[PDB]
A paper describes a structure:
Eventually, the structure of XlVMAT2WT was determined at 4.0 Å resolution after extensive data collection and processing. A total of 348 out of 514 residues were traced in the XlVMAT2WT structure, including all 12 TM helices and several connecting loops. Intriguingly, comparison to the hMCT2 structure revealed that the XlVMAT2WT structure adopts a canonical MFS fold. Unlike OaVMAT2TM8/9-BRIL, N- and C-domains of XlVMAT2WT are structurally similar, and could be superimposed with a Cα RMSD of 2.5 Å. The XlVMAT2WT structure was solved in an apo, lumen-facing open conformation with a large, deep cavity. Serotonin was placed in a pocket between TM5, TM7, TM8, TM10 and TM11 near the center of XlVMAT2WT. Meanwhile, the hydroxyl group of serotonin forms a hydrogen bond with the side chain of E311 (TM7), and its amine group interacts with side chains of N304 (TM7) and D398 (TM10) via a hydrogen bond and a salt bridge, respectively. Meanwhile, purified XlVMAT2WT showed reasonable binding affinities for substrates dopamine (Kd = 1.13 ± 0.52 μM) and serotonin (Kd = 0.43 ± 0.22 μM), and for the inhibitor reserpine (Kd = 17.0 ± 8.8 nM). The non-canonical structure of OaVMAT2TM8/9-BRIL forms a dimer, whereas the canonical structure of XlVMAT2WT is a monomer.
Vesicular monoamine transporter 2 (VMAT2) is responsible for H+-dependent uptake of monoamine neurotransmitters, e.g. dopamine (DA) and serotonin (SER), from the cytoplasm to presynaptic vesicles in monoaminergic neurons. Vesicular monoamine transporter 2 (VMAT2) belongs to the major facilitator superfamily (MFS), and mediates cytoplasmic monoamine packaging into presynaptic vesicles. Substrates bind to MFS transporters between N-domain and C-domain, and are transported by a rocker-switch alternating access mechanism. In this work, we report two cryo-EM structures of VMAT2, with VMAT2 from Xenopus laevis adopting a canonical MFS fold and an engineered VMAT2 from Ovis aries adopting a non-canonical fold.
Numbering used by the authors: 18 to 49, 125 to 244, 248 to 269, 285 to 322, 331 to 445, 450 to 470
The structure:
């Protein structure tokens, strides 16, 4: 009976990630400082998520999480269809903002409900690793499915008919500020670990073009690592797992950029994806453990902070891409990550 909530969270996360990733190959200018607006097109979702999550945080504790879940389903259902008839780019920006706030609400409600239903550490870790694996599956299957169905209304009909079953199942089933660094360390670690891939995402096509599917190895590694290295981390402490993951991602990021040939350039992305997935999966339940240590037993605000840290990198990663490219390696994030790694060496 308890696995129904996990299934609902899985479906919601997969749906949100699939909707997010389908926008990558198709652009409003493609279908017909322009690149600045193109970047803003996908930056708007992250910015509105960051702006909206903290305000909708405490409402979960004030009222509940099932009603926010139903509202997230409703807003997703009313927002997805609008992509079918798009007139102007500003309408696309508005649709992106609505989808972003809906995804934020759905994710926070799902994480809160999943944290509240299970009070056991290893089961909680397994459930959240399953959620992360579902996110990985969605981000992996988005682009190819969208690309193949673009040729064979048509681009989004499958999603429009898929949301219906999830909505029907969901319908049928029915202190703000912290000065403690013990959560801030995890927030910063996950923020930088996500900022690494956020910065790596747009820079690679520049090298590909100047040297004459890029994120597929990374997604494959993420999916094949998260679910397989999640549960085993409970056997021992979180020190070694997080430290090794941070060291691995730092080494991979430092070694990836320079490449004499491009055929083997995709191989380091496997290491990057494995490292980011391992770090995220290992670090996710530590916040819940700290909440259990804390007097407050409501996980809504801490998971809201976690999501804010998750989306901080997506907010303005590619904002300074051209300036960084014009600007000794162009990427130095690995050094920052490795020097910040020993901060989380000691844990309760």
């Amino acid at each position: 009976s308890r696995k129904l909530i996990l299934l609902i969270v899985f479906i919601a996360l997969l749906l949100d990630n699939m909707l997010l990733t389908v926008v990558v190959p198709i652009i409003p200018s493609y279908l017909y400082n322009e690149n600045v607006k193109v970047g803003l097109l996908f930056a708007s979702k992250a910015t509105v998520q960051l702006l909206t999550n903290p305000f909708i945080g405490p409402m979960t504790n004030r009222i509940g999480y099932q009603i926010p879940m139903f509202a997230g389903f409703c807003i997703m259902f009313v927002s997805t269809i609008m992509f079918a008839f798009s007139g102007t780019y500003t309408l696309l920006f508005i649709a992106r903002s609505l989808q972003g706030i809906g995804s934020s609400c759905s994710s926070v409600a799902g994480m809160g409900m999943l944290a509240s239903v299970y009070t056991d550490d290893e089961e909680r870790g397994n459930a959240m690793g399953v959620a992360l694996g579902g996110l990985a599956m969605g981000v992996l299957v988005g682009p190819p499915f969208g690309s193949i169905l673009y040729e064979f209304t048509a681009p989004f009909i499958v999603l429009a008919v898929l949301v219906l079953f999830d909505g029907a199942l969901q319908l049928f089933v029915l202190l703000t500020l912290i000065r403690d660094p013990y959560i801030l360390i995890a927030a910063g670690s996950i923020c930088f670990a996500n900022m690494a891939i956020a910065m790596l995402e747009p820079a690679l096509p520049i090298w590909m073009m100047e040297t004459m599917v890029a994120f597929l190895p990374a997604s494959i590694s993420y999916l094949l690592g998260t679910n397989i290295f999640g549960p085993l981390a409970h056997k021992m402490g979180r020190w070694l797992c997080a430290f090794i993951g941070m060291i691995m991602v730092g080494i991979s990021i430092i070694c990836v950029p320079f490449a004499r040939n491009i055929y083997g350039l995709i191989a380091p992305n496997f290491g990057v994806g494995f490292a980011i997935g391992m770090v995220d999966s290992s670090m996710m339940p530590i916040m819940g453990y700290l909440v259990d240590l804390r007097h407050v037993s409501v996980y809504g605000s801490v998971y809201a902070i976690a999501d804010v840290a998750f989306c901080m990198g997506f907010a303005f990663g590619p904002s300074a891409g051209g300036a960084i490219a014009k600007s000794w390696l162009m990427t130095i994030i690995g050094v920052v990550d490795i020097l910040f790694a020993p901060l989380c060496l000691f844990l309760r």
